[PDB]
Amino acid sequence: QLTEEQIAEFKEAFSLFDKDGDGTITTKELGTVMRSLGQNPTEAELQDMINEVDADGNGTIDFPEFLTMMARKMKDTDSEEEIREAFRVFDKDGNGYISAAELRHVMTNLGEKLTDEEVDEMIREADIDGDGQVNYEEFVQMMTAK
């Protein structure tokens, strides 16, 4: 059930990721952003992920493919591997604590501009104790939400 709002999100979000705006996502584009997250994965991990998301394996990911990928990460969000990968990526400092500055840097580095409020909402809502930081336990619980 794709609503007009959701479709508009892809157009804006996709356009943000696609610098040239060719209507296609290359490895260099996604790879660059995927690396800016303070992570340094090998082409094998990236290519492998793309292939799993590329229903046709054309080497590039189209908007439609992204939608499918989302359903997987959103439906399997309860995957230890997915959570572990996200936790490590999010915690660039490997301190085991997620801050607003770190999160904002990650979610933003996605070619999107989020305000301190947005990030605060994610953490504030994820912070059970309201310590201003989200722990792995809180992350896992917030990674199961629909």
Binding site: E5, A13, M70, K73, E118, E121
Partner: peptide
């Protein structure tokens, strides 16, 4: 890639 969605979730609320 969930990262992309993560931004969309918050961004969607902002709009």
């Amino acid at each position: 890639a969930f990262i992309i969605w993560l931004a969309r979730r918050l961004k969607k609320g902002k709009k």
